[PDB]
């Protein structure tokens with residue numbers, strides 16, 4: 020409210036399960052009026068899912084984040100990435116090292 | 130919580146009262162955990178059985 | 185492209201959009217439609233009565249999801265089909281066990297040459313209703329060893345909030361299936377992934393007992409197979425006694441499959457003995473039974489009446505049914521090689537135990553020898569002799585610790601030489617001072633113990649709440665002794 | 680045998696086994712229990728003998744049995760040691776099998792058909808089998824059963840009362 | 845529509861057999877499946893199911909063609925690798941080995 024334009028942010032919640040952590044996010048989205056969209060990532064291991072593919076492969080589709088942007092048709096929703104702690108981390112290519120390229124506050128702008 | 134389940138199941142407050150002592154009794158005896166989820170299951174169970182008892 | 189578009193339009197058009205199967209709402213009807221079509225299982229019956237009552241009371245029709253789990257062949261799948269017939273919504277089912285990729289649940293991207301929409305969409309294409317009773321089955325052993333769990337897609341399928349707009353690949357459209365009624369089956373809950381396990385109501389089908397297993401045999405198996413094979417009641421009468429013998433000897437399992445198959449062979453060999461055989465009216469008799477099945481596949485019930493020193497009957501809740509595993513231990517070396525020495529007699533544990541059972545056994549040993557010196561200082565049999573120990577494998581891993589109570593009673597028995605009282609089960613864990621602990625899965629245990637002629641069951645006192653949930657006949661004969669502190673067990677075990 | 684029998688005439692130290700044959704685990708399990716039961720039977724039977732109580736002993740069980748069937752051979756071992764224990768050549772062409780328990784109660788084992796047909800051509804004449812498996816021996820083609828004598832038992836102490844009259 | 849778009853193999857069998865009650869013999873079922881489409885087994889099950897196959901309908905011919913009188917059969921080396929939905933639709937029969945004194949009888953006769 021002191022500086023006009025909307026701002027983004029990253030946050031973490033943690034505690035025992037079932038404290039309402041998921042549901043309250045939706046309540047916040049209804050309060051601030053941003054759009055809501057849940058997205059679990061427990062155990063994900065296809066990093067390409069977050070970043071699409073070369074577009075020359077057959078069957079390629081753009082990664083999730085564009086899919087949700089296409090759904091919300093709005094520049095500034097409120098994604099709810101869930102259960103990041105359980106993200107897949109194996110020899111096949113850990114997505115979590117690619118999440119940093121989203122999550123980093125400065126560089127997400129590009 | 131209870132009103133939400135009650136609306137979830139169509140019953141209204143006139144039909145299924147839940148005296149508070151029963152509620153404290155449940156949380157203290159019939160399920161223990163920091164989370165409320167299992168208690169949510171219990172309360173819906175009592176409601177839904179109550180609904181069958183009405184119908 | 186024209187062919188792919190042909191397939192695509194045909195698929196998109198075939199999907200029902202607002203078609204709603206009608207839903208019967210006669211409580212008096214469904215009551216009989218269930219009770220006359222399946223035996224027992226009061227709780228599931230009562231639950232579906234709950235569901236109907238909720239939907240009729242709560243205005244418009246609604247979907248739901250549930251999770252049965254139990255021993256195989258117990259009727260899990262047939263009740264589901266009967267229920268679908270009862271509720272008037274259309275039926276469908278499909279296996280999930282051992283699959284890894286989601287494409288069968290998720291179709292394909294439809295630019296591929298072999299792409300087709302996922303199987304649920306086929307069920308929609310056939311089941312014209314937009315709210316069918318889907319029946320996923322044996323989720324507990326879904327294939328998940330490959331990199332990338334299908335189970336995440338499964339949780340994507342189940343959770344209602346995104347069930348409203350689930351998104352298949354072959355066609356790119358969100359699709360509500362909240363109206364759809366999922367059901368799922370498992371022989372053991374634990375193997376199912378936690379995020380999905382916490383999302384669903386649980387129900388446990390139990391194992392049928394011989395007395396009731398008979399009545400189902402002579403209501404739904406024999407008539408059914410007889411109509412299947414075309415024989416008529418004029419041809420193939422079976423006295424109940426031969427069925428008893430089939431149960432007593434030729435089949436020994438909590439389910440109703442092996443008895444099913446063997447009855448099938450009998451009826452089949454009867455029909456063969458009609459198509460050309462001299463008899464036009466079979467009447468199996470116990471003497472005659474051999475002709476159709478050959479010599480018995482079981483003869484012993486238990487491996488023998490217990491040897492007094494060093495064995496004990498032990499209930500265990502194995503992955504398939506209950507069972508009566510015996511714990512067995514023995515001396516390992518002459519006891520009195522050096523009466524004056526001081527080097528305590530080592531244990532030898534066996535039975536391919538996981539580590540937690542191993543320490544549990546060691547703990548049990550410590551408490552046992554503690555109690556032995558505690559009340560019998562003069563004795564030394566267990567402090568100065570090596571011993572080897574064996575708990576046969578088979579128990580579900582969670583049940584491993586429960587052996588400990590019996591284990592204590594093992595050593596002390598051998599330490600005393602006193603016979604254990606005949607046909608007297610016990611189970612449960614111990615806590616190093618004789619306090620006894622709650623244990624799960626009591627139902628199947630009491631089932632098998634009844635099956636083995638036990639009469640004087642001994643249980644943790646705390647868990648009595650469940651033992652009084654048993655059917656009135658199941659309790660017959662058995663003499664439960666609820667107890668909590670093991671010193672009581674020493675009283676009852678050795679009068 | 681593997682070391683001199685009186686290296687410690689008063690020594691309180693075990694007659695350690697040294698098994699060989701590229702064993703699997705379950706065979707180790709069955710072998711160990713067989714070792715113990717042998718030691719028990721001997722103390723119950725010939726208390727004065729202690730050859731097994733104090734004698735380090737090498738043992739060789741050749742590999743080749745199907746692994747699930749591997750415990751079935753235990754009973755043979757149980758006499759092997761006993762023969763060497765008591766110094767008695769085993770009685771001629773008397774093969775035996777079946778799993779055993781700590782009380783010497785033989786248990787059923789599978790694959791009798793393959794077992795019988797293979798032993799038939801070895802010249803064996805007096806097989807002994809679990810009585811609990813006996814019905815399957817009354818399902819094989821009759822010519823297989825002609826020739827060899829058969830026994831049936833439940834407690835191994837009988838088997839010891841057959842092989843060594 | 846494809847060049848040489850002959851009806852699938854069963855239709856050729858119907859041609860060769862010139863009769864409505866062949867002893868069709870599916871073979872080596874155990875290792876079918878796991879194609880690019882996952883499997884065609886669903887369509888095979890549609891064949892196996894009498895009410896569906898009663899008006900079985902190939903792509904090459906618009907007419908449904910009943911095949912109720914066909915006597916389908918199956919074989920597989922072992923009853924484990926077969927996909928379950930077909931497995932329940934069929935019965936299983938264990939096949940044994942041969943006696944050495946009888947294997948010679950075969951050796952002489954065939």
Ligand SMILES: Nc1ncnc2c1ncn2[C@@H]1O[C@H](COP(=O)(O)OP(=O)(O)OP(=O)(O)O)[C@@H](O)[C@H]1O
Pocket residue numbers: 221222223224254255256257258259260261262263369400404440441444
């Ligand atoms: N209560 C029952 N009423 C009628 N049939 C029964 C009942 N219980 C078992 N059955 C019989 O058991 C057989 C198989 O049962 P069902 O398939 O429902 O068992 P199941 O537990 O689904 O087995 P699995 O899940 O391992 O397939 C059926 O042929 C069925 O007739």
Ligand SMILES: Nc1ncnc2c1ncn2[C@@H]1O[C@H](COP(=O)(O)OP(=O)(O)O)[C@@H](O)[C@H]1O
Pocket residue numbers: 036037038039040041042043165166169
């Ligand atoms: N302070 C609270 N207010 C309202 N609901 C709560 C609260 N704490 C827990 N809950 C309940 O806990 C349940 C779990 O909520 P959710 O946040 O969806 O799961 P998670 O606990 O995994 O974040 C919801 O049904 C919610 O009503």
Ligand SMILES: [Mg+2]
Pocket residue numbers: 257260261262321
């Ligand atoms: Mg089933």
